[PDB]
């Protein structure tokens, strides 16, 4: 099984390892033994479906600070922290018109997501690890 000897479109034999040609069949088998042929041979989804959704009543309180929202949540009995994220109003269930604002929504696993619309462009940061906290001893979330 020689991977270099092939048949051309003229009824001959071609060796692509040394780039040689052979007319008859006796010259292709005799071209493997030699110095040039030897030199050429030597050179070469689960967590989303199991999440319970009961949609309880959230308790969010906003306060205009100057240099902050506080959400009171029940005991979740788990290490999963509620995540906050800022999204646009273009994606909705009914797609209502004149929706060109942004909304910061906080979502948890045993509870529903609470969303607050922000008319301003950029007045704060919606990062989870920058200006957010979640006290598990009192079970209260703070977003600044």
């Amino acid at each position: 099984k020689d991977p270099y000897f092939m048949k051309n479109h003229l009824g001959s034999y071609e060796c692509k390892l040394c780039l040689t040609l052979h007319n008859n069949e006796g010259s292709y088998l005799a071209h493997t033994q030699g110095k040039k042929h030897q030199t050429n041979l030597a050179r070469r989804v689960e967590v989303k479906k199991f999440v319970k959704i009961g949609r309880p009543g959230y308790k969010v309180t906003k306060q205009r600070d100057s240099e902050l929202f506080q959400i009171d949540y029940p005991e979740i009995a788990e290490g999963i922290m509620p995540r906050h994220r800022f999204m646009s109003a273009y994606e909705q269930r009914i797609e209502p018109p004149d929706r060109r604002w942004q909304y910061l929504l906080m979502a948890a696993e045993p509870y529903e997501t609470i969303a607050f619309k922000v008319p301003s462009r950029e007045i704060d940061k919606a990062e989870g690890k920058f200006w957010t906290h979640w006290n598990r001893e009192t079970k209260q979330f703070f977003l600044q």
Binding site: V45, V60, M87, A107
Partner: protein, 123 residues
């Protein structure tokens, strides 16, 4: 960078012999027309250099060799081996805590990328 390091070491040696927070040997030198940019906290080296002053606190300890002599760290290899084993156990516990924090961050990233972002409720 040897002259700046020597000046920082001299400032850490002169500031460690003070009896108050603001009454030191470097606060009065700033008003004596002496340029000292290593005293401000905005510099990148001063946060190490004041830590070198903490090393001066290591020269200000009573068991550091000023009024007493250490016998467990100087005449007992078994105590040094036990301290090295305790340091290795503390490093292993810190690595396990870092692995647990990385696993918790991965679990939070998996839970945040699987929640529904279309259930909006404005109250």
């Amino acid at each position: 960078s040897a002259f700046d390091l020597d000046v920082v070491k001299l400032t850490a040696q002169f500031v460690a012999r003070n009896g108050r927070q603001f009454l030191t040997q470097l606060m009065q030198k700033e008003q004596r027309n002496y340029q000292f940019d290593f005293l401000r906290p905005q510099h990148s080296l001063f946060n190490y250099f004041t830590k070198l002053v903490e090393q001066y606190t290591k020269i200000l300890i009573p068991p550091k060799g000023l009024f007493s002599k250490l016998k467990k760290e100087a005449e007992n290899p078994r105590e040094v081996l036990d301290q090295v084993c305790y340091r290795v156990e503390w490093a292993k516990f810190q690595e396990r805590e870092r692995k647990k924090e990385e696993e918790e961050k991965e679990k939070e990233r998996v839970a945040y990328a699987q929640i529904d972002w279309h259930d909006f409720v404005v109250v």
